[PDB]
């Protein structure tokens, strides 16, 4: 958040989950980032740069996460057709 | 009679059989004198009880394991079965037998090898 | 029955947004509902929407994000007179920095920030933020 | 996938899946477990697809790789079949096994001499190991597991469908899991057959 | 001298990164929404601005065949005026011990608050981001934004909490019983918490994402470390 002074106020900007486009708390203990490791996709070996996601605790605890992680990954690798 | 052994006996009995496994007989008198020498016992009467239970454990442990108490030679044979049980490798005769619409799945896996069939009967339950 | 068409539409989008759905089904379509959702799209609270056609009253399908929080109806439809406006705008909006009460005027349907610049009051329809 | 054939289905493994009866699946469905089933049989069996198994195996495995230190991807199983399997798993790839009764409060406590604090979990059968799953959402652990066709999905980020009512279906699936992580992280990859048997990942079973 | 100090040895992973000094703000912890379990972590980053304000020391008691048996339950607030506040309740058989038990529990539950402006910016926030609520068992508070210089207009009990939060100007409205202050204070605390969980058009820009402090500093967490 930016004032007319140009002072960039607010203690931190909180992360916004890709599960359902909404923002998690600071004591929500069911909200998990999950790092998937990319591979070269020519031999099948680790290659550097991870794809990281984040999911909110609310959709997790009702049990929607299995579809959400699949849908996110389906538009990338290592699922492209299921 | 009455009297069930207290927890002080059953707790320490387990320790004493574990670490001096190969120093026990199956006689009361020998196992008594051993407990006096390998460890302090604050009484004589207390010793005569703890010995007798140590004896009673040692009878069963030679017929296989008693839970919560693990001697060395049992954990040896545990590992020896777990690195490979004596039984053959095979999965499970290297032939697959399928049924109608298991074959249909396999078409949609884009493969087709080693065909067999067994024909199934209508219908679930009755 | 369904005496208020607009009132039945918005409750759906409210319920749906809470669960996290990003496609919905709203019926019956009315022209009034179209221009409503147009304003809600421009500002960027919802995405593009598809009008299925029948020969009855239509049905609408919407693509939405988690940006929406609450859109309400106000029944019955009161008048506003551009000094009554401020009294309204306090009550329906959580802030002075965002949210838009919507209304209809003789100059067409629009948000309140725009209506004040046309210098014309009119009849209030709903709100959102 | 997108790799040429080195991250895609192999002709060999299809035979192993079908010989171990993984394709067969229980007589019930959920509203989340109907996107991996194709259809039902003549019989009450519901037939899991193996294409759908294969993709889910991979990205599951790629997440298990992604930790820098593998010594804290804590595997858990309490049913008898998945005991022998997990022990070899956690010997092969650096992990910490928890076999048998869980003893709850493991990660919640601060004072307990069996305290653990992993990052991931890989659980067999959600509806036998419900205690660690519930406890996962108090310490922000991602979660992976093997679902039947009717196991409840809730605190399961990714599933890896399986038959898992026992038999060879259990041990085979843990073996395949351990094959993949070594191809990707290690240098075991050669795309020519691994030495280790799926035989010694199966259940001990009452012996002769 | 002749006397050392030795204070705090962490047995917790999060505690270990702080003691070895790789995490250097609370803002790192909160962004991953990590558990906190040790009350020295919070008191290391802060503890140079934390005050306590013992609200009530309330008796409760159960019944037994030998008569009464009385335990003392006290509520204790905690907060710096920079926007971190917390709250805790605890009970014990004796008084002083219960108070000191509450100051520990209160440190554990500290959270940040998000402050904003009335409608025009001039630097340094002074009020609540938006009109929010919070209910605890049919007590509720409705924090409503207010322009500068109106002070905090509330009952004495929430006037403690909001003042400790550093929120300068506010209007409030209550509903239902408020003479059972254990609910009343928790309901205030509930309301201030929700501020960062309220989505605003400001926050619609996309967050980059970054690897966990646990992940990046894992090479220091494995050598002999917990």
Curated annotation (Swiss-Prot), chain A:
Modified residues annotated as N-acetylmethionine in this record: 1
According to UniProt, the name of this protein is Small ribosomal subunit protein eS21
Q: Which Pfam families match?
A: Ribosomal_S21e
Compartments (UniProt record): Cytoplasm, Cytosol; Cytoplasm; Rough endoplasmic reticulum
Q: Does the keyword ATP-binding apply?
A: no
Q: Could you give the subunit structure recorded for this chain?
A: Component of the 40S small ribosomal subunit.
Similarity-based family: Belongs to the eukaryotic ribosomal protein eS21 family.
Query: What is the organism field in this record?
Result: Oryctolagus cuniculus (Rabbit)
- Keyword check for Transferase, yes or no: no
Question: Function, please?
Answer: Component of the small ribosomal subunit. The ribosome is a large ribonucleoprotein complex responsible for the synthesis of proteins in the cell.
What coarse category fits the chief subcellular location reported for this protein? cytoplasm
UniProtKB/Swiss-Prot annotation, chain B:
Q: Where is this cross-link: Glycyl lysine isopeptide (Lys-Gly) (interchain with G-Cter in SUMO1)?
A: 103
Cellular component terms (Gene Ontology): cytosolic ribosome; nucleolus; ribonucleoprotein complex
Tell me where the cross-link Glycyl lysine isopeptide (Lys-Gly) (interchain with G-Cter in SUMO2) is found.
Answer: 103
UniProt keyword Plastid present: no
InterPro entries per UniProt: Ribosomal_eS17, Ribosomal_eS17_CS, Ribosomal_eS17_sf
- PROSITE patterns listed in its UniProt record: RIBOSOMAL_S17E
* Keywords, sorted A to Z: Cytoplasm, Isopeptide bond, Nucleus, Phosphoprotein, Ribonucleoprotein, Ribosomal protein, Ubl conjugation
Which residues does the record list as Phosphoserine (modified residue)?
Answer: 113
Q: Which GO terms describe its molecular function?
A: structural constituent of ribosome
Residues recorded as bearing N6-succinyllysine in the entry: 19
One biological process GO term for this chain?
translation
| Posttranslational modification | Ubiquitinated at Lys-103 by RNF14 and RNF25 in response to ribosome collisions (ribosome stalling).
**Compartments, record wording:** Cytoplasm; Nucleus, Nucleolus
Assembly, in brief, is:
Component of the small ribosomal subunit. Part of the small subunit (SSU) processome, composed of more than 70 proteins and the RNA chaperone small nucleolar RNA (snoRNA) U3.
Q: What does this protein do?
A: Component of the small ribosomal subunit. The ribosome is a large ribonucleoprotein complex responsible for the synthesis of proteins in the cell. Part of the small subunit (SSU) processome, first precursor of the small eukaryotic ribosomal subunit. During the assembly of the SSU processome in the nucleolus, many ribosome biogenesis factors, an RNA chaperone and ribosomal proteins associate with the nascent pre-rRNA and work in concert to generate RNA folding, modifications, rearrangements and cleavage as well as targeted degradation of pre-ribosomal RNA by the RNA exosome.
Q: Which PANTHER family match?
A: 40S RIBOSOMAL PROTEIN S17
| Protein family membership | Belongs to the eukaryotic ribosomal protein eS17 family.
From Swiss-Prot, chain C:
Gene Ontology MF term list:
structural constituent of ribosome
Q: Which Pfam families match?
A: Ribosomal_S8 (PF00410)
- Entry GO CC: cytosolic ribosome; nucleolus; ribonucleoprotein complex
Q: Where in the cell is it found?
A: Cytoplasm; Nucleus, Nucleolus
The record's Gene Ontology biological-process terms are: translation
| SUPFAM superfamilies xref list | Ribosomal protein S8
Provide the leader sequence positions.
Answer: none
Protein function:
Component of the small ribosomal subunit. Part of the small subunit (SSU) processome, first precursor of the small eukaryotic ribosomal subunit. During the assembly of the SSU processome in the nucleolus, many ribosome biogenesis factors, an RNA chaperone and ribosomal proteins associate with the nascent pre-rRNA and work in concert to generate RNA folding, modifications, rearrangements and cleavage as well as targeted degradation of pre-ribosomal RNA by the RNA exosome. Required for proper erythropoiesis.
What is the similarity comment for this entry?
Belongs to the universal ribosomal protein uS8 family.
- What is the name of this protein? Small ribosomal subunit protein uS8
Organism encoding this protein: Oryctolagus cuniculus (Rabbit)
Q: Lineage of the source organism?
A: Eukaryota, Metazoa, Chordata, Craniata, Vertebrata
Gene that codes for this? RPS15A
UniProtKB/Swiss-Prot annotation, chain D:
Q: Which residues of the full protein are shown?
A: 2 to 209 of 295
Q: Where is this site: Cleavage?
A: 114-115, 132-133
> Which family is this sequence assigned to?
Belongs to the universal ribosomal protein uS2 family.
What is the gene called?
Answer: RPSA
Q: Where is this protein chiefly located?
A: membrane
The places in or outside the cell where this protein is found are: Cell membrane; Cytoplasm; Nucleus
Protein name as annotated:
Small ribosomal subunit protein uS2
- Chain residue ranges for the region called Interaction with PPP1R16B: 53-112
In this UniProt entry, the residues modified to N6-acetyllysine are 51, 88
Q: Give GO terms: molecular function aspect only.
A: laminin binding; laminin receptor activity; structural constituent of ribosome; virus receptor activity
Q: Any signal peptide, and if so, which residues?
A: none
The miscellaneous annotation reads: This protein appears to have acquired a second function as a laminin receptor specifically in the vertebrate lineage.
For the cross-link Glycyl lysine isopeptide (Lys-Gly) (interchain with G-Cter in SUMO2), what are the residue positions?
88
Functional note: Required for the assembly and/or stability of the 40S ribosomal subunit. Required for the processing of the 20S rRNA-precursor to mature 18S rRNA in a late step of the maturation of 40S ribosomal subunits. Also functions as a cell surface receptor for laminin. Plays a role in cell adhesion to the basement membrane and in the consequent activation of signaling transduction pathways. May play a role in cell fate determination and tissue morphogenesis. Also acts as a receptor for several other ligands, including the pathogenic prion protein, viruses, and bacteria.
Coiled-coil annotated residue ranges, if any: none
Which keywords, in A-to-Z order, does the entry hold?
Answer: Acetylation, Cell membrane, Cytoplasm, Host cell receptor for virus entry, Host-virus interaction, Isopeptide bond, Membrane, Nucleus, Phosphoprotein, Receptor, Repeat, Ribonucleoprotein, Ribosomal protein, Ubl conjugation
Superkingdom, natural source:
Eukaryota
């Amino acid at each position: 958040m930016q004032s007319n002074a140009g002072e960039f106020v607010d203690l931190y900007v909180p992360r916004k989950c890709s599960a359902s486009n909404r923002i998690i708390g600071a004591k929500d203990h069911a909200s998990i980032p999950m790092n998937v490791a990319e591979v070269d996709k020519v031999t099948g070996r680790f290659n550097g740069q991870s794809k990281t996601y984040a999911i909110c605790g609310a959709i997790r605890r009702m049990g929607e996460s299995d579809d959400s992680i699949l849908r996110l990954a389906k538009s990338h690798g290592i699922v492209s057709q299921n | 009679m009455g009297r069930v052994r207290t927890k002080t006996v059953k707790k320490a009995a387990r320790v004493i059989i574990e670490k001096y496994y190969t120093r026990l007989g199956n006689d009361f008198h020998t196992n008594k004198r051993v407990c006096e020498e390998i460890a302090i016992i604050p009484s004589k009467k207390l010793r005569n009880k703890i010995a007798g239970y140590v004896t009673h454990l040692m009878k069963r442990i030679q017929r296989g394991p008693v839970r919560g108490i693990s001697i060395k030679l049992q954990e040896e044979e545990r590992e020896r079965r777990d690195n490979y049980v004596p039984e053959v490798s095979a999965l499970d005769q290297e032939i697959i037998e399928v049924d109608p619409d298991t074959k249909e799945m396999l078409k949609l896996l884009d493969f087709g090898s080693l065909s067999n069939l067994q024909v199934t009967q209508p219908t679930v339950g009755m | 029955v369904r005496m208020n068409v607009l009132a039945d539409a918005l409750k759906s989008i409210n319920n749906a947004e809470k669960r996290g759905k990003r496609q919905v089904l709203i019926r019956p379509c009315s022209k009034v509902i179209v221009r409503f959702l147009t304003v809600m799209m421009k500002h960027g609270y919802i995405g593009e929407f598809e009008i299925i056609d029948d020969h009855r009253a239509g049905k609408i399908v919407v693509n939405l994000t988690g940006r929406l929080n609450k859109c309400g109806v106000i029944s019955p439809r009161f008048d506003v007179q551009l000094k009554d406006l401020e009294k309204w705008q306090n009550n329906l909006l959580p802030s002075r920095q965002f949210g838009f009460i919507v209304l209809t005027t003789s100059a067409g349907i629009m948000d309140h920030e725009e209506a004040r610049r046309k210098h014309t009051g009119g009849k209030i329809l709903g709100f959102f933020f | 996938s997108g790799a040429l054939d080195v991250l895609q289905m192999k002709e060999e493994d299809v035979l192993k899946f079908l010989a171990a009866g993984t394709h067969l699946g229980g007589t019930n469905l959920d509203f989340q477990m109907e996107q991996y089933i194709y259809k039902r049989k003549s019989d009450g069996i519901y037939i899991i697809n193996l294409k759908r198994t294969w993709e889910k195996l991979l990205l599951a495995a790629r997440a298990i790789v992604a930790i820098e230190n593998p010594a804290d991807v804590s595997v858990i199983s309490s049913r008898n079949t998945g005991q022998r399997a997990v022990l070899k798993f956690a010997a092969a790839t650096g992990a910490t096994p928890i076999a048998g009764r869980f003893t709850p409060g493991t990660f919640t406590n601060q004072i307990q001499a069996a305290f653990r604090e992993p990052r991931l979990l890989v659980v067999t059968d959600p509806r036998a190991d419900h205690q660690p799953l519930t406890e996962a959402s108090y310490v922000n652990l991602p979660t992976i597991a093997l679902c039947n066709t009717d196991s409840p999905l809730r605190y399961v980020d990714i599933a890896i469908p399986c038959n898992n009512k026992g038999a060879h279906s259990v041990g085979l699936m843990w073996w395949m899991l351990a094959r993949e992580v070594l191809r990707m992280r290690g240098t075991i990859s050669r795309e020519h057959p691994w030495e280790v048997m799926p035989d010694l990942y199966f259940y001990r079973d009452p012996e002769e | 001298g002749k006397a050392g100090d030795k204070e705090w040895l962490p047995v917790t992973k999060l505690g270990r990164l702080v003691k070895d000094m790789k995490i250097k703000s609370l803002e790192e912890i909160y962004l991953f929404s990590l558990p906190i379990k040790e009350s020295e972590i919070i008191d290391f980053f802060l503890g140079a601005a934390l005050k306590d304000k013992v609200l009530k020391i309330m008796p409760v008691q159960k019944q037994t065949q030998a008569g009464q048996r009385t335990r003392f339950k006290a509520f204790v607030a905690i907060g710096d005026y920079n926007g971190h506040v917390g709250l805790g309740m605890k009970c014990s058989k004796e008084v002083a011990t219960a108070i000191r038990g509450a100051i520990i529990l209160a440190k554990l539950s500290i959270v940040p608050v998000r402050r904003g402006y009335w409608g025009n910016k001039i630097g340094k926030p002074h009020t609540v981001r938006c009109k929010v609520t919070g209910r605890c068992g049919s007590v509720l508070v409705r924090l409503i934004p207010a322009p500068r210089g109106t002070g905090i207009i509330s009952a004495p009990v929430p006037k403690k909490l909001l003042l400790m939060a550093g929120i300068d100007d506010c209007y409030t409205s209550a509903g239902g019983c408020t003479a059972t202050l254990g609910n009343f204070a928790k309901a205030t605390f509930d309301a201030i918490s929700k501020t960062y969980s309220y989505l605003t058009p400001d926050l619609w820009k996309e967050t980059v994402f970054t690897k966990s402090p646990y992940q990046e500093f894992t090479d220091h967490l494995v050598k002999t470390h917990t």
